[PDB]
Design a protein around this ligand. Sequence first.
Ligand code: HEM
Ligand code: HEM
Ligand code: HEM
Ligand code: HEM
Ligand SMILES: [Zn+2]
Ligand SMILES: [Zn+2]
Ligand SMILES: [Zn+2]
Ligand SMILES: [Zn+2]
Ligand SMILES: [Zn+2]
Ligand SMILES: [Zn+2]
Ligand SMILES: [Zn+2]
Ligand SMILES: [Zn+2]
Ligand SMILES: [Zn+2]
Ligand SMILES: [Zn+2]
Ligand SMILES: [Zn+2]
Ligand SMILES: [Zn+2]
Ligand SMILES: [Zn+2]
Ligand SMILES: [Zn+2]
Lengths: 157, 157, 157, 157, 157, 157, 157
Amino acid sequence: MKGDTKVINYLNKLLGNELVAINQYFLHARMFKNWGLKRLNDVEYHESIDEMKHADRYIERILFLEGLPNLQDLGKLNIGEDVEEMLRSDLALELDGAKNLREAIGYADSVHDYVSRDMMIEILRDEEGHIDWLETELDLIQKMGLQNYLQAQIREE
Amino acid sequence: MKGDTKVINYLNKLLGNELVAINQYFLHARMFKNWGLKRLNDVEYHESIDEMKHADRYIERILFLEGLPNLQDLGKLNIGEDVEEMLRSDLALELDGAKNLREAIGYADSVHDYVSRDMMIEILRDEEGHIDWLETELDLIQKMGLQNYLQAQIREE
Amino acid sequence: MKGDTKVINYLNKLLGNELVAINQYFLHARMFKNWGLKRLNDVEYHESIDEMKHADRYIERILFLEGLPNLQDLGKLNIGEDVEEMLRSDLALELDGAKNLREAIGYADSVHDYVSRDMMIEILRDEEGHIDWLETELDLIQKMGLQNYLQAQIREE
Amino acid sequence: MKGDTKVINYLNKLLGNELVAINQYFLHARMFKNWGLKRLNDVEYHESIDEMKHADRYIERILFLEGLPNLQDLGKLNIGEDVEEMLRSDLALELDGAKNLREAIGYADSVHDYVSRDMMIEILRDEEGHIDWLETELDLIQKMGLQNYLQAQIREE
Amino acid sequence: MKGDTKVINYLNKLLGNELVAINQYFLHARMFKNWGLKRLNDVEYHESIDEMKHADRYIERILFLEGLPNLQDLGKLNIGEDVEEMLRSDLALELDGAKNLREAIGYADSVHDYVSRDMMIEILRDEEGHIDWLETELDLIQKMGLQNYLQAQIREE
Amino acid sequence: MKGDTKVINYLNKLLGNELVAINQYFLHARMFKNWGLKRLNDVEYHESIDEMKHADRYIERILFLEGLPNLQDLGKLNIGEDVEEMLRSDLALELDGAKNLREAIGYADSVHDYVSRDMMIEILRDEEGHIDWLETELDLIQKMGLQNYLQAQIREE
Amino acid sequence: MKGDTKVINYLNKLLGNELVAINQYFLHARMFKNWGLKRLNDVEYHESIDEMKHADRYIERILFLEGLPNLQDLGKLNIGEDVEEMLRSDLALELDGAKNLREAIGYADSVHDYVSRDMMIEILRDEEGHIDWLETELDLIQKMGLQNYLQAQIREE
Ligand code: HEM
Ligand code: HEM
Ligand code: HEM
Ligand code: HEM
Ligand SMILES: [Zn+2]
Ligand SMILES: [Zn+2]
Ligand SMILES: [Zn+2]
Ligand SMILES: [Zn+2]
Ligand SMILES: [Zn+2]
Ligand SMILES: [Zn+2]
Ligand SMILES: [Zn+2]
Ligand SMILES: [Zn+2]
Ligand SMILES: [Zn+2]
Ligand SMILES: [Zn+2]
Ligand SMILES: [Zn+2]
Ligand SMILES: [Zn+2]
Ligand SMILES: [Zn+2]
Ligand SMILES: [Zn+2]
């Protein structure tokens, strides 16, 4: 069913955001796992899988709309070297992604692509969940101190 | 069955205390949940449901005695901005509540409303349990320090 | 994640509507139960619980958006003294609430708060169910007459 | 297998009767559900479904006989505005349809289409059950009065 | 254990109230069953049994206190001839019995018979439930009229 | 609850679309079944049931909004005579219906009927699935040729 | 445990080959799904998951050896527009990848990194499975012709 060209361009842009987040969260999860921070590996691994499922939904929607999914153009990763810097980099990426989502959702409504919009709102709700988790962990580091915070990560929850 | 007017007035006063406590505990619980303090969310939410059940018991008893439950006049909430201030505010509210309960219990006995009295003694028992929990947590903060105490709240028990 | 100030104000106003509805429905449920109208007790009790669940969603959303939930300012209850008066008061209240809901949903969209919008649309759907139930009962009183209507309430459904 | 032209014409006539009855019973059922008359929604929905299965049987039989089922020419619905008027309209429609069935059954026998005949007799048996249910409900309205009658419809059977 | 003489006298007075109520409720229940009012037979039979368990508790307590249970002096029954008169007679009897219970409870406290007191308060709680059921039924008769009220009694609940 | 008059008009137009689609998908299904194309019978039968469920949602919504469902005015069927023509006819009908949905969804938003809008977006989502299925089948016929395509339809999936 | 620098570089190169394969196979899988070729969607999806699992083993090994996994530099995708082109492209990618693997396995042995070698031989055996499946499918297209081959993909296996 031929979709609106600019809607397909926005979906490719959001797919590009999910591709960056997949790699960044998956690498962060295995860095945490290597350091023995099991709880953080578990959450970040599951965050990584959520972004993979988001990428799948964009890929299928784009193809349904008769566009060409662009899995070629990976954007900048910001890996970071310590726990706080890693979580802050994830959070910055998420806030940028939500901004792009909000734009695409408004546009999709104005051209009456309500099914693309409905899918993007469900994805945005998941992203707000990822944001909440990141903001909360960053705050906990501040309130209990990094040493207590790291000790809390060693067992799976 | 027409009840004593002053007993109905005391029951409405106690109902009013429960209404404040329901709101204060429920909001505290969701504040803790938002901060990622799961154990405190769990306990405060259950303390909140306990007060809801107390409020139910007063409402039914007042109607049985042919009075008019007053759910309109909400007393002052004292929310607080940090863990210790919140728990201290719940404790202050509970202690004021137990005082009113003791007074009503004595009076119900004087006019031979022993069933309203039996109900109030059971609620007072529950309130002494909320007080015990609050006092103990405040003492733990002091003994282990705030950072260790916060760390201990992040997993459910 | 910092929310739009006016969205938070709308959320607090809708929360205020839920708090009124919780109390009014709960007290009506127990009045019905005291009169031995078990079926009306059951339905009104379940609507009060639905409104409690709505209040909880507003509270959690306001806190996530970094605002202050206002559980202090209870609006006017209109209790009523007989079955038809009580149902009509619940109806007027629902209709006023639905009006404020529609206004907030439109505004959430203008500022791209699509998750708050998506939440409030699910709550609106629930409110339209409460309205449908109230309007239907009111029409049944008219069609079968009050005595038959009361008779049909004495057994739980 | 090439069927008799007039038999196919009769089958299309009866299919037309079924298509009117599907819509009329379905709409009556949902009108009853909207009014809170659950018992009547339940019966009329199930009659609607009976008529749908009758239509399916005509369609398949016409196809087997190498004819063209006509689902295009919808006959006149008579919806009605209150319970008695709705039931009486369903009854008039069923009586008309039974008269057409009797004629078609006679004709199928004279051209030796005994399988079309046997199908139509099983459908006529179901229609006589529909007529019996309608005649009985209308008589109950008279005997107990409309107010008691409507009260009797509010719960599922 | 030798009990207080007046406490035993009060226990025998209350036992006497129970013995009247057993007979009156049992006979009312069977009168209702004979008339085909099954719901009322069911409730009144179960009230009869409650009173029997109350009597058993008085008998055992008087024996433990080294007193002589008096099952000889049956007080006045007031049976009544129609549903409302029967219920109103049960209610008057229960109100009288509650007044005697209140007096005995006050007295047991002043002589430090706290276990007799605790038993009597549990019995008073059950009696207030009996009073509530009666008051509610009598009000239902008024609100829906006697004919609808009797119709509502023909099936078991 | 009194709905917006133009919303009810749109709901009636959409209902009219579903009614055409019910009949056309149902007749196509049984034509495939008669031809021994069991796979196509199964899919088209399930699409017809999907449109019946859509039609039920429109009817209940219009009644809730105090409108009159119009099941009388059946639009034009285009049945077709061979597999490819029938599929193309279903596709043209679906695309016209999706255009009407988009218009109604926009309008519903402008008058704040967010629950009617929410219902229509779910239905649109289903229609886009119908569309995808039809487009895919039509492309398969071209890719593998009609003879292989027919062969693939004889067994149930 | 500090690994050999050139081993880590080989590991990063092979991880790069997996990242290309994950994307190419996943998009191919969803392209097949869109065309209604379910059997091809299923196999290519499961091959993509295989590559994801390989990527994970490289990442974990590189971190264990204290190197930095490079998930930033994505190599050239060759997507293709029809089934045969897409399969040939996956085949070319696989053969290039197996070449890089053979080279790395040899070198791991020269520097006594036998655990890296053991991991890479297991991945190579999986890659030879992917190669076998692709060569086999390409040969089937030529032996049965593309129309029959496409017909054979529409049902899942
Ligand atoms: C186009 C990019 C990718 C897409 C679309 C994608 C997609 C998916 C999907 C749909 C699943 C199934 C998840 C579920 O439903 O449970 C999955 C699983 C998985 N993915 Fe990816 N993924 C991508 C990239 C990656 C990358 C780069 C890694 C690198 C580690 C990875 C690692 C995994 C792992 C370990 C699993 C679980 C496999 C298992 O044990 O079953 N994925 N992926
Ligand atoms: C008049 C004031 C209230 C009364 C009398 C009341 C009463 C009740 C009662 C009786 C229950 C059932 C508890 C049980 O048996 O487990 C309940 C549950 C609940 N209440 Fe309230 N409540 C009141 C106010 C509130 C408020 C202000 C909130 C705000 C959030 C709230 C939130 C809840 C929640 C989330 C539940 C659990 C419902 C569930 O099962 O999911 N209540 N309440
Ligand atoms: C009119 C006179 C009385 C009648 C008609 C009556 C009748 C009955 C009946 C029909 C039962 C149920 C029996 C069964 O099927 O198991 C019962 C139970 C019982 N009765 Fe009576 N009774 C009378 C007087 C009394 C008195 C004076 C007592 C003094 C204690 C008494 C004590 C009990 C007790 C303890 C039970 C068993 C209750 C339970 O635990 O379920 N009854 N009676
Ligand atoms: C107003 C229009 C129609 C409406 C509203 C309607 C509605 C429905 C509904 C709600 C169901 C039950 C679906 C489920 O939940 O599984 C159903 C079933 C069915 N319908 Fe219709 N339908 C309509 C027209 C038709 C027509 C013209 C046919 C012609 C055959 C038909 C044939 C059937 C059949 C065979 C079933 C399944 C019956 C069974 O075996 O239980 N319907 N319909
Ligand atoms: Zn995402
Ligand atoms: Zn995310
Ligand atoms: Zn309390
Ligand atoms: Zn408390
Ligand atoms: Zn609500
Ligand atoms: Zn509501
Ligand atoms: Zn029929
Ligand atoms: Zn019929
Ligand atoms: Zn007793
Ligand atoms: Zn009693
Ligand atoms: Zn549809
Ligand atoms: Zn459709
Ligand atoms: Zn691989
Ligand atoms: Zn491979």
